[PDB]
Homo-oligomer: A and B are copies of this chain.
């Protein structure tokens, strides 16, 4: 079978500039946090483009 190793992380509030900083200090391609102003769950991620992409996960 296929085993997916889980990496547990605790969601925290911060600026998207902060998320970028922290993501890079780990070289991760994915950084999930809760937007400091908006309050919603955000996922900063590096596109195949190389550029950054920001996803907002609607708790809807």
Contacts and interface: CB of A to CB of B under 8 A. Distances in A.
Interface of A: 2, 4-11, 16, 29-30, 32, 41-45, 48, 51-60
Overall SS of chain A's interface: strand
Given A30-B43, A30-B45, A45-B30, A54 B6 contact: yes
A11 B9 CA distance: 18
A48 B6 CA distance: 16
A56 B41 CA distance: 12
A32 B30 CA distance: 11
A10 B48 contact: no
Contacts of A9: 55-58
A55 to B, nearest CB: 5
